[PDB]
Structure 1
Amino acid sequence: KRPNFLVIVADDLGFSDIGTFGGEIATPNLDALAIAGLRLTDFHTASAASPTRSMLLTGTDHHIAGIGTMAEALLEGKPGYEGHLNERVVALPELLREAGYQTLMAGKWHLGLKPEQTPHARGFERSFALLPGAANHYGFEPPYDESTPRILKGTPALYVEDERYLDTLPEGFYSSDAFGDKLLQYLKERDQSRPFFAYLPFSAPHWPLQAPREIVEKYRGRYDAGPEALRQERLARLKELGLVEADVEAHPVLALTREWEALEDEERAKSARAMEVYAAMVERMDWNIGRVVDYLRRQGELDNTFVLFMSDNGAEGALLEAFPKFGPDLLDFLDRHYDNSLENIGRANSYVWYGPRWAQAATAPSRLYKAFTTQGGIRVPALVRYPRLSRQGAISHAFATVMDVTPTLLDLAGVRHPGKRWRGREIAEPRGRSWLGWLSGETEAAHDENTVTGWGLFGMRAIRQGDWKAVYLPAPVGPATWQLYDLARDPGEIHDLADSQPGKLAELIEHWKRYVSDTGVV
Structure 2
Amino acid sequence: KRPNFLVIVADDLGFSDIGAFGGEIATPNLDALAIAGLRLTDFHTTSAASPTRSMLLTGTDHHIAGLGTVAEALTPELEGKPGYEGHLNERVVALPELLREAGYQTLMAGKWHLGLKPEQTPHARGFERSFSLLPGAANHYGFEPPYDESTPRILKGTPALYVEDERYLDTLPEGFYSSDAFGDKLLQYLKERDQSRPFFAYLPFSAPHWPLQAPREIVEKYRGRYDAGPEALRQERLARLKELGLVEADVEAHPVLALTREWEALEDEERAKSARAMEVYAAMVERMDWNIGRVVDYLRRQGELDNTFVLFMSDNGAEGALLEAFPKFGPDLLDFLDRHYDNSLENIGSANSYVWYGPRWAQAATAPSRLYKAFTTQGGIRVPALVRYPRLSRQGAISHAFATVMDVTPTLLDLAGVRHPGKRWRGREIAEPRGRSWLGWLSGETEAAHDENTVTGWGLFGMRAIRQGDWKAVYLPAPVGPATWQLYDLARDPGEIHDLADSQPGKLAELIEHWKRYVSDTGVV
The interval holding the TM-score normalised by the smaller chain is over 0.9
- 1:424 is displaced (CA, Å) by 1.0
**What 5-or-longer segments of structure 1 have no aligned partner?**
none
Q: What secondary structure, in the 3-state scheme, does the structure 2 residue paired with 1:491 have?
A: coil
Q: What secondary structure, in the 3-state scheme, does the structure 1 residue paired with 2:55 have?
A: helix
Distance 1:490 1:355 in 2: 25
Residue of structure 2 aligned with 1:92, choices 95, 101, 116:
95
1:438-468: CA deviation from partner (whole Å, max 9, x where unpaired): 0000000000000000000000000000000
Cα RMSD (Å) of the superposition? Answer: 0.3
Distance 1:380 1:431 in 2: 19
- 1:254 is displaced (CA, Å) by 0.3
Q: What secondary structure, in the 3-state scheme, does the structure 2 residue paired with 1:456 have?
A: strand
- 1:511 is displaced (CA, Å) by 0.1
Distance 2:8 2:477 in 1: 33
- 1:369 is displaced (CA, Å) by 0.2
1:199-219: CA deviation from partner (whole Å, max 9, x where unpaired): 000000000000000000000
Q: Does 1:426 align with 2:429?
A: yes
Aligned to 1:494: 497
- 1:358 is displaced (CA, Å) by 0.2
- 1:340 is displaced (CA, Å) by 0.1
- 1:109 is displaced (CA, Å) by 0.2
Q: What secondary structure, in the 3-state scheme, does the structure 2 residue paired with 1:344 have?
A: coil
- 1:187 is displaced (CA, Å) by 0.1
Aligned to 1:340: 343
Aligned to 1:73: 73
Aligned to 1:42: 42
- 1:322 is displaced (CA, Å) by 0.4
Q: Does 1:481 align with 2:484?
A: yes
Q: What secondary structure, in the 3-state scheme, does the structure 2 residue paired with 1:310 have?
A: strand
Q: What secondary structure, in the 3-state scheme, does the structure 2 residue paired with 1:313 have?
A: coil
1:17-68: CA deviation from partner (whole Å, max 9, x where unpaired): 0000000000000000000000000000000000000000000000000000
Aligned pairs for 1:361-440 (under 5 A) are 361-440=364-443
- 1:93 is displaced (CA, Å) by 0.3
- 1:325 is displaced (CA, Å) by 0.9
Distance 1:309 1:495 in 2: 32
Residue of structure 2 aligned with 1:128, choices 112, 128, 131:
131
Distance 2:79 2:454 in 1: 31
1:390-419: CA deviation from partner (whole Å, max 9, x where unpaired): 100000000000000000000000000000
- 1:73 is displaced (CA, Å) by 0.2
Distance 1:82 1:218 in 2: 44
1:210-238: CA deviation from partner (whole Å, max 9, x where unpaired): 00000000000000000000000000000
1:256-315: CA deviation from partner (whole Å, max 9, x where unpaired): 010000000000000000000000000000000000000000000000000000000000
1:99-156: CA deviation from partner (whole Å, max 9, x where unpaired): 0000000000000000000000000000000000000000000000111000000000
Q: What secondary structure, in the 3-state scheme, does the structure 1 residue paired with 2:383 have?
A: coil
Q: What secondary structure, in the 3-state scheme, does the structure 1 residue paired with 2:72 have?
A: coil
Distance 2:147 2:245 in 1: 49
Distance 1:147 1:68 in 2: 29
1:319-359: CA deviation from partner (whole Å, max 9, x where unpaired): 00001110010000000000000000000000000000000
Q: What secondary structure, in the 3-state scheme, does the structure 2 residue paired with 1:217 have?
A: helix
Distance 2:14 2:65 in 1: 25
Q: Does 1:304 align with 2:307?
A: yes
Aligned pairs for 1:442-461 (under 5 A) are 442-461=445-464
Distance 1:116 1:146 in 2: 28
Aligned to 1:290: 293
1:133-192: CA deviation from partner (whole Å, max 9, x where unpaired): 000000000000111000000000000000000000001000000000000000000000
Distance 2:386 2:108 in 1: 20
Distance 1:475 1:186 in 2: 48
Aligned pairs for 1:91-170 (under 5 A) are 91-170=94-173
Q: Does 1:21 align with 2:15?
A: no
Distance 1:450 1:492 in 2: 22
Distance 2:407 2:259 in 1: 36
Distance 2:72 2:382 in 1: 23
Q: What secondary structure, in the 3-state scheme, does the structure 2 residue paired with 1:308 have?
A: strand
- 1:489 is displaced (CA, Å) by 0.2
Distance 2:43 2:510 in 1: 23
Distance 1:326 1:193 in 2: 49
Q: What secondary structure, in the 3-state scheme, does the structure 2 residue paired with 1:77 have?
A: coil
1:54-99: CA deviation from partner (whole Å, max 9, x where unpaired): 0000000000000000010010111000110000000000000000
**What 5-or-longer segments of structure 2 have no aligned partner?**
none
Q: What secondary structure, in the 3-state scheme, does the structure 1 residue paired with 2:163 have?
A: strand
Distance 1:264 1:436 in 2: 53
Distance 2:85 2:256 in 1: 35
- 1:385 is displaced (CA, Å) by 0.3
Distance 1:457 1:424 in 2: 31
Distance 2:328 2:488 in 1: 32
Q: What secondary structure, in the 3-state scheme, does the structure 1 residue paired with 2:499 have?
A: coil
What is the count of residue pairs matched by the alignment? 522
Distance 1:77 1:331 in 2: 34
Q: What secondary structure, in the 3-state scheme, does the structure 2 residue paired with 1:470 have?
A: strand
- 1:363 is displaced (CA, Å) by 0.3
Distance 2:248 2:478 in 1: 31
Distance 1:335 1:160 in 2: 30
Distance 1:254 1:81 in 2: 31
Distance 1:311 1:127 in 2: 20
Q: What secondary structure, in the 3-state scheme, does the structure 2 residue paired with 1:471 have?
A: strand
Distance 2:498 2:207 in 1: 34
Distance 1:147 1:479 in 2: 36
Aligned pairs for 1:230-241 (under 5 A) are 230-241=233-244
Residue of structure 2 aligned with 1:210, choices 197, 206, 213:
213
Distance 2:521 2:435 in 1: 14
Distance 1:109 1:198 in 2: 14
Q: Structure 1 segments of 4 or more deviating over 2 A?
A: none
- 1:427 is displaced (CA, Å) by 0.3
Distance 2:285 2:457 in 1: 30
